[PDB]
């Protein structure tokens, strides 16, 4: 007579599309402690929803129609639109919270706003910060997804996000995920370049972006020693999804999608779980804390101070 509470089959919502708190998740939270939270940040079609699903309760053999975090549809790409609005919520059997978000600085959102306080552009540029800060405050790990390398605008947006957060200070970890990578990106010569650029671009960020999640020690580069790199930041690469001599396949130059996804999942479930506030929280007090944090972020001052400057 020690059955579990209940199993979830699909994700739910946590913040309405109009930035409004939704209290419909306590039905799945317990009074247990030592929980782990995860968040994401990215643009329109980087692959956020398709990543969290595979990291929490999904496999590559399944179909995009069974993902707990709905992905984009063909009818949505040919029209240049989005599919994720607000913030989602999900919790697995291992008692790990996952949070999906909407793209930052999305053109579709602005376009929609057109047909509906000074300019909507500043409003859309604010929402992104309003969300990034909240995530940097109520999360242990924050993943950043990208389609191509070195956008140069994301590094500025991030730094500007950690300066308007609510408030011996807390700074979460950071992971740099490179989605849709290719052979040219699985070369040591370019690998060191990536690490070098990331280090010189986030030297005064205060965020934990190094000293963890070393793909070098996960068998991705078998015969490569750590001395080849001056400083290995926490970066990961995810590629594109898919008598005897004649059937040999082609040379792709990188490991399969399944292997890398599995390794990333294993390394994410092993991330630290330090305290957020000055107290030990459970799967409920955290919910209340986050609600208060959101209510505060909205009626903040630094954000308004930055909005008036635009």
């Amino acid at each position: 007579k020690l059955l579990p509470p209940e199993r979830m089959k699909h994700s739910i919502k946590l913040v309405d599309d109009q930035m409004n708190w939704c209290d419909s998740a306590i039905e799945y939270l317990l009074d247990q402690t030592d929980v782990l939270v995860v968040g994401v940040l990215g643009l329109q079609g980087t692959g956020k929803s398709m990543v969290m699903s595979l990291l929490s309760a999904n496999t590559p053999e399944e179909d995009q129609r069974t993902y707990v975090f709905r992905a984009q549809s063909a009818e949505m790409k040919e029209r240049g639109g989005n599919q994720t609005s607000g913030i989602d919520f999900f919790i697995t059997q291992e008692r790990i919270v996952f949070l999906d978000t909407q793209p930052i600085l999305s053109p579709s959102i602005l376009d929609h706003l057109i047909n509906n306080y000074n300019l909507p552009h500043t409003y859309v540029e604010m929402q992104s910060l309003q969300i990034a800060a909240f995530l940097f405050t109520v999360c242990h790990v924050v993943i950043v997804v990208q389609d191509w390398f070195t956008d140069l605008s994301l590094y500025r947006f991030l730094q500007t996000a950690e300066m308007v957060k609510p408030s011996t200070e807390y700074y979460p970890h950071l992971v740099f995920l490179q989605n849709k990578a290719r052979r040219e990106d699985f070369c040591p010569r370019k690998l060191r370049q990536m690490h070098l650029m990331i280090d010189q671009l986030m030297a005064h960020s205060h965020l934990r972006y190094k000293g963890t999640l070393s793909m070098l020690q996960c068998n991705v580069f078998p015969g490569l020693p750590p001395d080849f790199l001056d400083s290995e930041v926490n970066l990961f690469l995810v590629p594109f999804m898919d008598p005897l001599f004649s059937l040999l396949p082609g040379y792709r130059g990188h490991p399969s999608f399944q292997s890398l996804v599995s390794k990333l999942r294993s390394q994410v479930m092993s991330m630290a779980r330090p305290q957020l506030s000055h107290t030990i929280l459970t799967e409920k007090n955290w919910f209340h804390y986050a609600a208060r944090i959101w209510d505060g972020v909205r009626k903040s001052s630094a954000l308004a101070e930055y909005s008036r400057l635009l």
Binding site: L43, Q44, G45, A74, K77, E78, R79, G80, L105, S106, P107, S108, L110, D111, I114, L119, P120, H121, V124, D147, W148, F149, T150, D151, L152, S153, R156, T160, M163, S167, T168, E169, K180, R182, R183, E184, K190, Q193, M194, L196, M197, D199, Q200, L201, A203, H204, F240, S246, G250, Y251, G253, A302, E305, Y306, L309, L310
Partner: protein, 376 residues
């Protein structure tokens, strides 16, 4: 294929030929084949830019006689071949100097962009993905307001040149036309639907932001109204040449871009021009088809350019520096309104570091420290 400064200095074979200039800019990715060089090598049909070939900005040019067209290419931090050099140096040879470093580079590329927006007929921006960076809606907005402030300093130079009447007035041959190039990157005929969608988006964005208007004079650039102005480059095996070879090995053992650009170059070579005005009462836009020497005569005088320093030192890291300064200042109150002495010193220092911080905390910190040490 030679630098701009190394060209204006030095023609007789083509000293007189009606031409059309084409400016190229945008971002790129860390690859071996830039999305700009391949473009030229693809249009001209010849390998112009071969394979395996203080400031971090640059310009390049190339004139094609078989087509009577001049190409200008821009390169700045936005790219990666340069950003890599910047970081590499910064690694060998403070949270107060680096900020100024990046800010200076941004200003440099901004003026280098204004240059193209003044001596070009057509110009296009490239992007590695379909989705376009909305932040552009701000760059352009912060660019026009600048040219105007410095417009006299320009016309006061080409003044003694054969530019013409309208050219000498607006320091431009005609309101340039902007084109967009997007790389598929594995996404996805439907391409046409995507193109039209992006066009509608860009139009509404630049319209609500007022970057585009009915008058084709006040605006710094314009887009068409009946033709297409968005191209999507699909996949291609050319990239990653090694891969291609391997593919070939496995075998020995077992509209269009040019057509998309000519529809716009013809209107200029034929002297017709561009007429974009739908204000219910359109106005006429000037135009001028110069020659080689007649063009360099002004290009050199503009490239050789004094108040631009003061005009650009006001124009984005500016908001970041402003926020950091305002924060440190507003916090100085609680730092001074709190205070052997080391106890109170460290206490106020911690309260200050926890009350607010930014990119200029060193100054506001040393100030409070000195004040405390002087008040006892």
């Amino acid at each position: 294929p030679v630098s701009l400064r190394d060209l204006l200095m030095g023609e007789p074979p083509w000293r007189e030929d009606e031409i059309c200039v084409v400016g190229i800019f945008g971002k790129t990715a860390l690859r071996l084949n830039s999305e700009k060089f391949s473009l030229v090598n693809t249009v001209c049909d010849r390998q112009v830019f071969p394979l395996f070939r203080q400031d971090y900005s640059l310009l390049q040019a190339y004139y094609s006689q078989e087509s009577k067209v001049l190409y200008l290419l821009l390169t700045s931090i936005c790219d990666n071949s340069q950003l890599l050099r910047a970081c590499r140096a910064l690694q060998s040879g403070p949270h107060a100097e680096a900020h100024e470093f990046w800010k200076h580079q941004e200003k440099l590329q901004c003026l280098s962009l204004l240059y193209l927006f003044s001596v070009c007929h057509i110009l296009l921006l490239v992007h590695p993905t379909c989705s376009f960076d909305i932040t552009y809606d701000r760059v352009f907005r912060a660019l026009d307001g600048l040219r105007q402030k410095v417009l006299p300093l320009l016309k006061t130079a080409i003044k003694d040149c054969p530019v013409g009447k309208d050219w000498k007035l607006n320091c431009r041959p005609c309101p340039p036309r902007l084109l967009f190039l997007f790389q598929l990157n594995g996404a996805l005929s439907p391409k046409r639907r995507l193109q039209h969608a992006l066009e509608d988006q860009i139009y509404r964005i630049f319209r609500k932001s007022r970057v585009l208007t009915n008058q084709s004079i006040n605006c710094l650039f314009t887009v068409p109204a009946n033709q297409a102005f968005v191209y999507i480059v699909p996949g291609s095996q050319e990239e990653d040449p090694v891969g291609m070879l391997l593919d070939q090995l496995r075998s020995h053992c077992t509209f269009t871009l040019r057509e998309f650009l000519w529809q716009h170059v013809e209107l200029v070579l034929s002297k017709k021009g561009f007429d974009d005005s739908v204000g219910r009462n359109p106005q006429p836009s000037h135009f001028e088809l110069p020659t080689y020497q007649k063009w360099i005569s002004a290009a050199s005088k503009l490239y050789e350019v004094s108040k631009i320093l003061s005009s650009i030192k006001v124009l984005f890291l500016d908001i970041d520096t402003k926020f950091s300064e305002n924060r440190c200042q507003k916090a100085l109150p609680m730092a001074h309104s709190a205070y052997v002495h080391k106890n109170q010193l460290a206490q106020a220092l911690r309260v200050y570091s926890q009350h607010a911080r930014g990119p200029a905390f060193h100054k506001y910190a040393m100030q409070l420290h000195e004040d405390c040490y002087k008040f006892w």
